[PDB]
Amino acid sequence: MRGQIRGLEMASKNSQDGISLIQTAEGALTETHAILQRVRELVVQAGNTGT
Amino acid sequence: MRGQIRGLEMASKNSQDGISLIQTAEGALTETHAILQRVRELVVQAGNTGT
Secondary structure, three states, X not given: OHHHHHHHHHHHHHXXXXXXXXXXXXXXXXXXXXXXXXXXXXXXXXXXXXX | OXXXXXXHHHHHHHHHHHHHHHHHHHHHHHHHHXXXXXXXXXXXXXXXXXX
């Protein structure tokens, strides 16, 4: 029982560090989005040929 | 009868020293447990690959 208790708390902390890592990755994907939006805009106007 | 009386008291003391020895061994096994718990924890987190 002690084994599973302590290992279960540590399993919580494991999952929590997992959350943290994912939050970092996802933040990188946020700034990825913002950039790709800029790109899309630049493409729309760049597709505004004639002017 | 005297033989068995005195030898039976001394048989008690024999068993009592046996208890003592076993208590020592078992204490060593207590600290063994605590260590193995630490080990198990270190294995769980060490199995938390990805982070």
